Amino acid sequence: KTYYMDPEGSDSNPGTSDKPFATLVKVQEVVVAGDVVYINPGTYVVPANQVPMTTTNSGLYHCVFHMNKSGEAGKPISYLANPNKQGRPIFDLSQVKPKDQRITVFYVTGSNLYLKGFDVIGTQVTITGHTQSECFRIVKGANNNKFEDLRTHDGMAIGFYLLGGSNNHILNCDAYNNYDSVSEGGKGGNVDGFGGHINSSSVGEGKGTGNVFEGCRAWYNSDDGFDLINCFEAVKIINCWSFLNGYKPGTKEVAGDGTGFKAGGYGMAADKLPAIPSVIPQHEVRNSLAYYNRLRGFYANHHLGGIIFESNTAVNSGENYNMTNRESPLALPPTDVNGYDHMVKNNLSLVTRSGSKHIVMVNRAKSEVSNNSFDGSEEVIETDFISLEEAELMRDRKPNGDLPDVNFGKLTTDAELRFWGMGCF
Numbered sequence: 272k273t274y275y276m277d278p279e280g281s282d283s284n285p286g287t288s289d290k291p292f293a294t295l296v297k298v299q300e301v302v303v304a305g306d307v308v309y310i311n312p313g314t315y316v317v318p319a320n321q322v323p324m325t326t327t328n329s330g331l332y333h334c335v336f337h338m339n340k341s342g343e344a345g346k347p348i349s350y351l352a353n354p355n356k357q358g359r360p361i362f363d364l365s366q367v368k369p370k371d372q373r374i375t376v377f378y379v380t381g382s383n384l385y386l387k388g389f390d391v392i393g394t395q396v397t398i399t400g401h402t403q404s405e406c407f408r409i410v411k412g413a414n415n416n417k418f419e420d421l422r423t424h425d426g427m428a429i430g431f432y433l434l435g436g437s438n439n440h441i442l443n444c445d446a447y448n449n450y451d452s453v454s455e456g457g458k459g460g461n462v463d464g465f466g467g468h469i470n471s472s473s474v475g476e477g478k479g480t481g482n483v484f485e486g487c488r489a490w491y492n493s494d495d496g497f498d499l500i501n502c503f504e505a506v507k508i509i510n511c512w513s514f515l516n517g518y519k520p521g522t523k524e525v526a527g528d529g530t531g532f533k534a535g536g537y538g539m540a541a542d543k544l545p546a547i548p549s550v551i552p553q554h555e556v557r558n559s560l561a562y563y564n565r566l567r568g569f570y571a572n573h574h575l576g577g578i579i580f581e582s583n584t585a586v587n588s589g590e591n592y593n594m595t596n597r598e599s600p601l602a603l604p605p606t607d608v609n610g611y612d613h614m615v616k617n618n619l620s621l622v623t624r625s626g627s628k629h630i631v632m633v634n635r636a637k638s639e640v641s642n643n644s645f646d647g648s649e650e651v652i653e654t655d656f657i658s659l660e661e662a663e664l665m666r667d668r669k670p671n672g673d674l675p676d677v678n679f680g681k682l683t684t685d686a687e688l689r690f691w692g693m694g695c696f
């Protein structure tokens with residue numbers, strides 16, 4: 272079956288093209304494996320009083336849409352912007368403010384799902400202590416899903432937040448202009464674009480493995496663009512752009528941590544040891560771009576082992592590459608050391624911003640550090656690039672959702688010969 276929804280539809284309708292549904296709550300009542308839902312473009316304001324589809328964590332979370340049904344292998348359930356209509360569906364969550372609860376807009380427990388082509392805006396935070404909300408929260412048991420050309424923006428919530436699940440592909444998604452102005456004095460320190468945090472409950476082959484962020488952009492998230500702390504299976508970030516994170520949206524006002532790619536770690540607590548996986552995962556950041564994050568570009572974040580940083584480009588992102596690891600095995604007090612077991616290869620780094628640096632805190636005897644611009648005999652300069660115009664990075668995606676063509680961060684023909692094989696382009 273192909274069902275339809277529309278902002279001016281009705282949940283008393285049958286869900287046909289002529290008589291569409293109004294909400295995903297009704298969609299969820301009827302769909303089965305192999306069904307397709309075409310979501311007509313327009314603005315869907317979620318009513319303030321719409322009851323949550325579920326709650327989690329002893330009532331802490333109000334979950335707007337519970338993506339609880341599953342497809343089968345070869346027969347997904349697909350929730351797609353209607354490809355026969357121009358424009359995008361935009362779910363506006365600005366009225367949803369349940370007292371004393373965190374918000375999850377799409378709480379994903381099902382498997383074999385395909386979600387494409389729509390936006391989630393205005394997601395709220397009302398709690399004033401330590402808190403967060405998420406546009407997408409994916410957990411243990413949610414396997415073999417695809418999230419494509421989705422945009423989580425102009426709200427107070429983390430865009431994508433993985434606590435578990437396997438083979439979740441987050442492809443060509445944007446998370447931008449996300450800032451929690453409400454909690455903890457409006458620091459914004461828990462709002463990332465994309466978070467990979469496969470927890471202890473979700474470990475194992477086919478249980479927490481295989482999740483990938485690909486082709487995604489994160490900008491003006493108040494904390495980090497991408498963050499893989501406390502992530503018990505390897506997560507990969509491939510062909511992603513992370514820029515202008517750590518600032519309040521549209522400004523250079525200081526907010527949170529400002530990392531482009533925070534690519535590991537299990538914390539640096541002084542009081543107690545963190546839980547850790549049995550095998551420290553080798554997360555990866557490859558063919559990616561960091562530009563003008565407030566503090567750091569590509570960061571090992573006190574990892575307890577090796578990360579792969581391959582074929583990336585950093586421009587004016589503070590510490591463009593920082594390989595700091597925590598000393599292993601775990602001990603107290605916690606100790607930072609030069610990064611060990613990393614692969615740092617074929618990277619490019621430009622510095623013309625005051626206080627920015629190429630690479631810090633790498634152990635070259637324990638990490639493979641090869642063919643990076645910062646270890647060559649010539650400095651990388653601005654005119655080695657075709658363009659460094661920031662606006663290019665915010666250009667509209669192509670109609671199919673692919674990243675826009677840009678010259679930003681692309682070496683000229685002449686420079687490419689002097690920095691051969693280096694950088695994300």
Ligand SMILES: C[C@@H]1O[C@@H](O[C@@H]2[C@H](O)[C@@H](O)[C@@H](O[C@@H]3[C@H](O)[C@@H](O)[C@H](C)O[C@H]3O)O[C@@H]2C(=O)O)[C@H](O)[C@H](O)[C@H]1O
Nearest residue numbers: 328331401402403429460461462466468470498500501
């Ligand atoms: C619902 C809570 O879940 C757990 O706490 C998580 C997380 O395990 C903690 O490490 C910590 O994480 C913070 C941020 O909240 C998180 O977004 C970021 C990626 O890492 C740390 O900065 O708090 C989390 C949280 O959700 O509050 C624990 O099981 C808590 O007891 C539980 O309330």
Ligand SMILES: [Ca+2]
Nearest residue numbers: 460461494528
């Ligand atoms: Ca933070």
Ligand SMILES: [Ca+2]
Nearest residue numbers: 463494495498
């Ligand atoms: Ca973060």
